[model samples]
Target: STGSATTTPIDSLDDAYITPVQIGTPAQTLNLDFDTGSSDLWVFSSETTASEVXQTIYTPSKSTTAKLLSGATWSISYGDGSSSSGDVYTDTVSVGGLTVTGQAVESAKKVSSSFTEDSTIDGLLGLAFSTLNTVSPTQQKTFFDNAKASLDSPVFTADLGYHAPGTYNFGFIDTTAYTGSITYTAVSTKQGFWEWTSTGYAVGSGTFKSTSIDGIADTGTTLLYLPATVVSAYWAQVSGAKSSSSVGGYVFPCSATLPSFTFGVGSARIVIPGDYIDFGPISTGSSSCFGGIQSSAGIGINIFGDVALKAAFVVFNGATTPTLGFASK
Candidate 1:
């Protein structure tokens, strides 16, 4: 019992990453963003605002296994302030061939304007933790948690590629996807996030400072967020790099060569190439390019998002003693 799937980058800028998921009995497929930051497997569906619908949505009425979870409702607000809410229904949900019966499928009756504008995403598949599920009366389990017992091992791996396809494996680790040894660290489930303490960080090939940096590994996020001090320390080394209010983050001359970033997981260090750090131009006419690594002051939490995740093979271990493993690739 294992499941495997390929995650595809939805845009050239790598703003959103998605994977095909089959929902309902007849298996209506939709490209869902497998997010490790939030909990609640929700989808845009027949209930979605008809005028705003643009993606393939789940229609519970069309499925034989669909059963409305009477009185149950779900409402979720993202860090970006975008939100979705609707009634709940249990249906057969499958990802990469691994199927879960009676999985809670939250149907979006209403979605924010941001989601309506994005257009590529069908919905979100939350993997953070069941504790964060927004379903009222009865919280639902994540696809990973639902399939854990039948799996060979209670674990899942994320290898989100940069502007390419990466594999998401459930039950077993794909040893070949990474190099060297995996550095395992304790995960603090406080607030229902995959929160862990990073050992330290370095700029380019500079010295690795030994300090504790508490953060979460969020696949749903687009960039890497860190303490303002850490962000300034890195950008200071780049010529013409400045904190631009108009750009909404630290930006620099698009031609300036950016330095590589290194973060530690225990004793192991994962390096994010400079090419990935240069997110892209702020606008069509702007010469300043926004950085992939930004200050977390606004969010109030550090997040190791795609910009950081794509640099290594990550393991989300579900056990009595839950831990996160980081392996350089």
Candidate 2:
């Protein structure tokens, strides 16, 4: 099992995308995805059951600074019907120049019916607020929850630049990297998943349309699920929109001239590029998997996923401000 997903088994950071964690005396570091979808941390082990499934496994023995979370067990489930489970432990967790000593960590020993069984990534690091924090019982605080007090005034930002995997740049928001005043929206802690409010919506080369709709940005999911009205208005722009039967998501013609769509947060806007309509080579001929703007039923919450935010940079300022900031990459 551990040998299977060894190569690309690491989970892509959805929230902040990257955070530093300790391994040994600050010599070895881990780049965490800083997910807000779940609560746990897992990595691949070099020594494990020689399963050929192609995923990664976590090994606690790798760090002399690692501490076992005795009597602490963890299990998490996702909306896409996947799960992971293991024991909690403690180690040095770092980000940029910040490091939390004796930090609580989750060492996953079992993952069933999920990406771990076939992912090439090395591991997953969750960074939800206190709601999904495994260390909640200790102080009911997420990594960002506890770090907020130590951050610079009014901010902490994450720049998911395309050049590198990404980094958790704390302290303050880099104003030069974006356009307009930074959109500051508070996060909601109502349900098991982290949800937030959106000020308005915008389409490429179009003006911002205010909406009563709000959504949760989740990394564990793969599609851009929007409110019914949002989808209806968005698809209305494209004349030949259709439900893709082949790939089963949503699709338009190969020649469809779709522009970028953005969700406004105050004066700032997070524009989703047109490239999202094209899913990739696997669905090239089908076009259905192109992942076009689609509708979600009733009043179900909108989920702003990796599909949308992949265009520009996103900053999850948990340490200083309890807000998510959006700007251009």
Candidate 3:
């Protein structure tokens, strides 16, 4: 699954509901995935020395989007062994004024199955905090690297909302005053993700006290997976939320006895309802599987996915803070 990209449908360029803006304009017009999982800007290139039949990679020199950068070398790896490495370049990347160019580009010379196959994905433009970047040990720059100078605030925010179809806006921290207060936590430099030390997680109505729980706010992941301890504690917290004890993971009864859990970050509480616990229905009246709540390896850090940030306005401030902040979306 590490090689896998987005499970959601890729709306073609002809999709009337989607909007197209000038990216790194004046340089190149490349389509990249704005992923939240591993922070890095990777695109398929006409220069790639592999065989790609149904996929398209970003060719910087071709598009008239934009260009500007010192050309560096970068190599990256995901939690699932999916890796990419290549020379670094700069180009204009546009999404919606959120246009930030001269951004570092990791022209992957190597990629895994999910990224190299006939999947509808073209490339990836990670919009997480610079600290969470996979290119850190190499390029040392994130998508917000150059744009930080002209942003509205000293902070960069990625506002992803379900505006009918859904919109991904990455620029400066525009939304601050929402749910309550914004708590800036310290990021752990000793890890891959900006696995900042946190308090704990709460599933359904259950709350755990541990601070470390394989935590990661991955935008690319569709579900929420917790460590066995966190998962068990969470299920125990809920009235009847328990792993089917059958096979998969922390599956609970679909009846009213299930309790909705909330994954707490600092003071910002993220509520994961019962319905999200299961993905979809296996059959009519058959209990749906939980997506947000599930048992996973205790990887010593919390892995926060779209499930935890579903309806919230989570922001990755690459401008000022050395970390990211989350608020009500």
Candidate 4:
């Protein structure tokens, strides 16, 4: 065996990939953001305030096998500054068809305003390294970590799509999901991230630059954030484009013809379509559109988020030292 799940993209948002996951004994299902940037499986639960429970929450009391991890708790703040904290519950959790008999499911007691205002997402399922898990007193393994030994191949694939449906596969790869050969790249787990240094990048059809750009494959982030120089060079190619403090990123005329962005993964070049580069309007009915590529200034590290990942088929391997595989889709 193997387990596979399909992910649905929120229309217009194109910012997050969501999947249904079951928690506890009777299997209470909830929609969760499958995040590769952080390690903590948390959900809005019975412990959340009535006002905070905008989405379907997990009610542990309704489950026969829920166990409280006394003295264990978790608090997490994301890169974008949203946060949540809660007590720990050990429960049988399942994603797609894979089950982890004793998975740590964090039940939220409090959530930041960022999460409170967001009506679509119920919680997050962290797919990063176990070392990055926020649980304390006793660190917990992620669902994938527990299920790896039982998986037929100990690998998983992320097929994130643009405003469309995608599939996540565990234990085996689906040959038909991608085109061409898959390129493998060694990932550095030192930062507890799927971090890698790209061979280089190019603006549109220009020649590939041989500079080393260190970044991470982060499904949790919404945009592609690179160094200031790289980002500046990209926007310079577009006419009537400017960095706007009000918009908080580079914005261009709605009619501008944006060019594709290509970054190297070893010898393979992954090209992000020009249309995908225009994330969306800066505001409803606005003439300015935000660019999918942004600067990593305060964030401190470049991030290859959904914008880049959706353009390729990604494989995450945790069987040994982590490795990432990319294929053009």
Candidate 3 Cα errors over 4 Å, as ranges: 1-31, 64-73, 128-140, 159-164, 171-183, 190-192, 206-214, 236-248, 251-258, 281-290, 298-300
Cα error, candidate 1, residue 7 (Å) = 0.5
Q: lDDT of each prediction vs. the true structure?
A: 0.92, 0.56, 0.54, 0.90
| Clash counts for all predictions | 0, 22, 37, 0
Which model, 1 or 3, shows the larger lDDT? 1
Q: Give the TM-score of candidate 3.
A: 0.73
Expressed as tens digits, the lDDT of each residue in 1-329 for candidate 2 is: 00000111133322224344544453455544556566556544433334523643445666677777667766666665666556666776655556556656665555554454544444566556556655434523444554566666424444443223543455565567566556557776666455677778876677788775567766544457887667766766776666655655555666677777887776666777776644443343554335445565633668766566555556665533356766666
What TM-score goes with each of the models?
0.98, 0.78, 0.73, 0.98
Maximum-lDDT candidate: 1
Query: Distance from true position, residue 301, model 2, in Å?
Result: 2.5
Per-residue lDDT over 238-289 for candidate 3, one digit per residue giving the tens place of the 0 to 100 score:
5545555454555545563455666556766655565545454334566643
Model 1, range 152-181, lDDT digits (tens) per residue? 999999999888999899889998999998
